[PDB]
Design a protein around this nucleic acid. Structure first.
Length: 85
DNA sequence: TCTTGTTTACATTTTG
DNA sequence: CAAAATGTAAACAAGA
């Protein structure tokens, strides 16, 4: 590909996306979109890295996971940052 | 169904 | 390097 892999880890990409969000939380697709909008490199192999992103969210304890919900449902759950920074 | 999450198991890269 | 983090790959579960 014509573009270099951005110097940010998946954790850094997810973290930047959530912080810069107005609610300090994002959905899975919102994180997907954020990364792809900014970095053309991730407009390919989306099967691969989106899987690694989903893995990154479930693996790292710095990522919750906030129910929507009952009012305005509903796709997936919001992901945000643990106050432990 | 697909998308969204979780978990396992292994690889690869980064760093002290 | 060797340990520590990060990434890949695969399976299933859960749910709108």
């Amino acid at each position: 590909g014509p573009h270099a892999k951005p110097p940010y880890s998946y954790i850094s990409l997810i973290t930047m996306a959530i912080q810069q969000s107005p609610n300090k939380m994002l959905t899975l697709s919102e994180i997907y979109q954020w990364i792809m909008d900014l970095f053309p490199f991730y407009r390919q192999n989306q099967q691969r890295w989106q899987n690694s992103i989903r893995h990154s969210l479930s693996f790292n304890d710095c990522f919750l996971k906030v129910p929507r919900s009952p009012d305005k449902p509903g796709k997936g759950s919001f992901w945000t940052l643990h106050p432990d920074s």
